[PDB]
Amino acid sequence: MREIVHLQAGQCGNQIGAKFWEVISDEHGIDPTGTYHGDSDLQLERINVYYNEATGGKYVPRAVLVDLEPGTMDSVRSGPFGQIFRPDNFVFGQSGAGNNWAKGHYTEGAELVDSVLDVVRKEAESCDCLQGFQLTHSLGGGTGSGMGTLLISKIREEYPDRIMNTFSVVPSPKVSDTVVEPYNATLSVHQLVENTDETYCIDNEALYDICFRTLKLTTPTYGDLNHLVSATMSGVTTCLRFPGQLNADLRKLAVNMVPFPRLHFFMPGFAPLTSRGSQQYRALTVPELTQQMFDAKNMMAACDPRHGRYLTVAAVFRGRMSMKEVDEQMLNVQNKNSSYFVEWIPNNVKTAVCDIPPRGLKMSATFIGNSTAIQELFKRISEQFTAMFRRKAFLHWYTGEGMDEMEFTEAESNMNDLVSEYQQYQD
């Protein structure tokens, strides 16, 4: 059948995937030990998209976990699910990263690529018919960037026929911590736009704003933020595993979503988010779900598209519904702002209907869109790169690694070409 394989790269990718897999195991009711307790037939027979059976009825995750700092995955192991994660799957690294993109891009990976490729191709043989793979990391994440570049590069040629989903968290515009971070991000995004097909966009500042908005809980964990985001990605993956008349294929989505090859970046949206009073101060109807769903407040991805226009939008809606509600909702929103979209393509809304509702609540939905809301981001990165490349700060490290400024020139040039493309298409 048709399956996908997970990759957790970088110190974020690891912890992200920890949250992800524990959540999925909860949803399908596998004990942390690994002995599933029969609750849901359909989930039992659909689980084979991601899990592989181990003797006694044990369903091993098909995720490849990579990093260089032992403590990260060791802490994850100390978590309540490393026992279901396999010692075979764990690959360790012979370096402290230094958060150096060039180091993680030319020297350290030079001797790991072989082994990691062999492990993932063993996994590919383990699976039978793939759609592709998905990855989780950060664009600014040094190890994740420096390695994901090479690994995705290779996987592209060995399998030019499969979808390489990229789920890289986007850092704060107002703080970057790392000062060479814009350099690393631009480096990454060059080959990112060059290879990738799907790119996600998620931002910590937006998460904090939402926490203060509706979570209202004062002090969360970044793990609670991951709670939210892994809930979103679980929602987008609900389609493949579930019955109900919706079309699940990520390619079925992407063909609709991408008018042109230079369109890669996509902005999620998540359905009902509730606070202490609101659990009993709110009801569950498609109009209010859609209203909240299409709110710059409920927006969490990059930044407000209020400055721009929407190009493509696609949402999935989970629970027991009918067609007429979403029909009237899309017609409504279409009429309420026939302005804020583009003439170029009318009727840019794509929807899916999943029957099997989530555990804990009845009605849910997810939404992913392409609008002109990345221009601020990459204009910012342009001005940052120029501002610290006018005098070439911190350059001695990357020269010691053995790189040259022409790489930076061409990369920023490609980024500016994408700037012009996004600008021109909408205006």
Partner: protein, 438 residues
């Protein structure tokens, strides 16, 4: 794995290492016997010690630090002290002669016959250690003996091992207090010898430590005891990264890279805000806002350079204990908004964050308080070069009158060293203003 090796060079370094290693054994709850209670922490050397101690199957921790001395009184005293069973006999490397503060004496006379010895020690530890991310050197610029010794050993470790990080720590010359007027001489010798190999140098000053002590520690008659406790608290905060885990884990290599923009100048400065008396903590409150404001307050730095005379390039905040990221980002955003703060236009981002869950515990017989949120704040700014201007207008007059250089000519060195070093330092100042200007 994740460990490093420390060198404690100097009479000056023995007190500080002694107090520090006391503190480490203390937070780890290490019995002065050399072994643990019935609790299970001993083995082959894989647990919180494993970076610092090497507790073999015999069950005895082996700290990964070499203490070198030339005046045997102090080293024999500590040899007769409490933790001597812990301390390996000849790891306490001792010499029987003294350099009389002279850099040339300690750099040519004694070092040659002892550098092979310390090399043997360090290689015979390097074999057994696993990851060895770097080296933690406790020294001083005006080394009453450590100056030339440290310079030569730094030369040799650089030439043989140009791959790993090197971390240097020194009590900086007091701008207005000096026991010796040849301290500028030998200190600038050390600096000019270091710059072309020195990886990351951090300085501290005792006067401001005194000032803090009677500012908010309520001590008017201080001792090396409190001095060492606080400097060791700083280094303990920095080593807690290796010790425990946290929200994010950062590294000395990250600090090296991201703290310095351009070569040569690799001399940032520390700052620890939450020092306060126990009763003051008992009837007052701590939070990220005020501690950030304090660590940004001009009179909260161990070096007396005015930030309104300086300009900010690099900063690094490390929290230890229980905090959240919301107030972190909010406070740093407020700082960036604050106009009195003056960063360079080069770096719209100029900071490095680190977070650790583990609460800072308390040493019995200390003088600190019971903290719940701690931070180390490491910054490089432009206000530094005034110190070197001070030192150069000090040095040039005493060199024109060349007072007591006859000692140096007797020990056999010449003036070309001073010749080169003066314009080397001058090149350093000129670097400083050309980077300060945009």
């Amino acid at each position: 794995m994740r460990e490093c090796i420390s060198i404690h060079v100097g009479q000056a370094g023995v007190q500080i290492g002694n107090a520090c290693w006391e503190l480490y054994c203390l937070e780890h709850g290490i019995q002065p016997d050399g072994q643990m209670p019935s609790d299970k922490t001993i083995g082959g050397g894989d647990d919180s010690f494993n970076t610092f101690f090497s507790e073999t199957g015999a069950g005895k921790h082996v700290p990964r630090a070499v203490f070198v001395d030339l005046e045997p009184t102090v080293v024999d005293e500590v040899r007769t002290g409490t933790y001597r069973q812990l301390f390996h006999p000849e790891q306490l490397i001792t010499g029987k002669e003294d350099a009389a503060n002279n850099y040339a004496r300690g750099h040519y006379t004694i070092g040659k016959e002892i550098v092979d010895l310390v090399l043997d020690r360090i290689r015979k530890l390097a074999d057994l250690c696993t990851g060895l991310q770097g080296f933690l050197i406790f020294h001083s610029f005006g080394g009453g003996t450590g100056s030339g010794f440290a310079s030569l050993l730094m030369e040799r470790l650089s030439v043989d091992y140009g791959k790993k990080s090197k971390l240097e720590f020194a009590i900086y010359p007091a701008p207005q207090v000096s026991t010796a007027v040849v301290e500028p001489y030998n200190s600038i010798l050390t600096t000019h010898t270091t710059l072309e190999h020195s990886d990351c140098a951090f300085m501290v000053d005792n006067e401001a430590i005194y000032d803090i002590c009677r500012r908010n520690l309520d001590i008017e008659r201080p001792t090396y005891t409190n001095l060492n406790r606080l400097i060791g608290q700083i280094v303990s905060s920095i080593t807690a990264s290796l010790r425990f885990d946290g929200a994010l884990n950062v590294d000395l290599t990250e600090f090296q890279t991201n703290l310095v923009p351009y070569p040569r100048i690799h001399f940032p400065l520390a700052t620890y805000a939450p020092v306060i008396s126990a009763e003051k903590a008992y009837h007052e409150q701590l939070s990220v806002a005020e501690i950030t404001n304090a660590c940004f307050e001009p009179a909260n730095q161990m070096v007396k350079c005015d930030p309104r005379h300086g300009k900010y390039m690099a900063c690094c905040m490390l929290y230890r204990g229980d905090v959240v990221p919301k107030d972190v980002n909010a406070a740093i955003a407020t700082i960036k908004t604050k106009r009195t703060i003056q960063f360079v236009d080069w770096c719209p981002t100029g900071f490095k964050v680190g977070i650790n869950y583990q609460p800072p515990t308390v040493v019995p017989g200390g003088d600190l308080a019971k903290v719940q949120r701690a931070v180390c704040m490491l910054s490089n700014t432009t206000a530094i070069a005034e110190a070197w201007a001070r030192l150069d207008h000090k040095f040039d007059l005493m060199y024109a009158k060349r007072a007591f250089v006859h000692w140096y000519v007797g020990e056999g060195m010449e003036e070309g060293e001073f010749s080169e070093a003066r314009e080397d330092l001058a090149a350093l100042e000129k670097d400083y203003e050309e980077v300060g200007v945009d």
